[PDB]
Amino acid sequence: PELGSREIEILGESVVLVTAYDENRKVVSQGSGFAVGTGLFATNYHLVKDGVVVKITAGDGKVYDVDGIVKYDKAKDLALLKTTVETGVNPLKLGTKKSLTKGSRIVAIGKANAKNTVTKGSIKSLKVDGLTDAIELSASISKESTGGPVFDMKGNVVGITAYGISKQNVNAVIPADYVADWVKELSKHSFGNIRIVRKTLVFDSDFEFNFVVYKIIRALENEDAATYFGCMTDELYKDETRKNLEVLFTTYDLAYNIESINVVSKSEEQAKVSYVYTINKEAGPNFKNYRIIGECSLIKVDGTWKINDSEEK
């Protein structure tokens, strides 16, 4: 009852390279992921959280654009990505942590920069002190394989590698049950109907405009008023806004989940961009989580695009 090389090679064809880029096309993070649907890939949240643009590379070299993050869990360092198109990458069958015993053998597969690394090991413990639900392994899985699948001797995905998720030198993996729950919920929706929770951009002809809106929302999320006011014309700055931001940044920890950013209209010195995002409270006193559906006007000032008006509901 041991997973053979032939099976490992076949399962490895579902493992992909996940690369996140900043607005200047620089690589900010890179790791592994795996297909769990035709256009759905599981990975770590840390590999994509700072990616303005995210790309997936399959074992055959094919590169796919990421449309956005459809599910995520910060405490479990978990993310589910949706590609802009359905890919030819075969989804992997997911198992459960309920079948695991301590001492049982596992195989982790990761994609280096798009060739595979196979790491062998065993289950040390069915819990990890400090984590709500994690599995401890007897030895380490390399940083480059993070976000990749962990298989049992039957070939089912029982975990997801998560480099640095616990205390230093603790080797912990997240149970596949969490990804299976997301896949089951999303299974009831067609591909085109799956909704984005945290939007990632593509380097297309609309990038210059969509990025202003992406940057200004990201600045509110990072508690960065200097970047927030830098995204708008000098005219839009108000002392009252600056004061309101100080209270918001010190009172709460907030997540700004972007659903969509789209150019409505554009020209050489003027543009309109629509956007949808939610504000979710992670910590602090009472806060009513809410959705913002807006549209803003942009103008080119000394070459740099800036927001000169907005309307939100």
UniProtKB/Swiss-Prot annotation:
It is found in: Cell membrane. It comes from the Bacteria. This is Anti-sigma-I factor RsgI9. It comes from Acetivibrio thermocellus (strain ATCC 27405 / DSM 1237 / JCM 9322 / NBRC 103400 / NCIMB 10682 / NRRL B-4536 / VPI 7372) (Clostridium thermocellum). The gene is rsgI9. The chain holds residues 389 to 702 of 707 of the full protein.
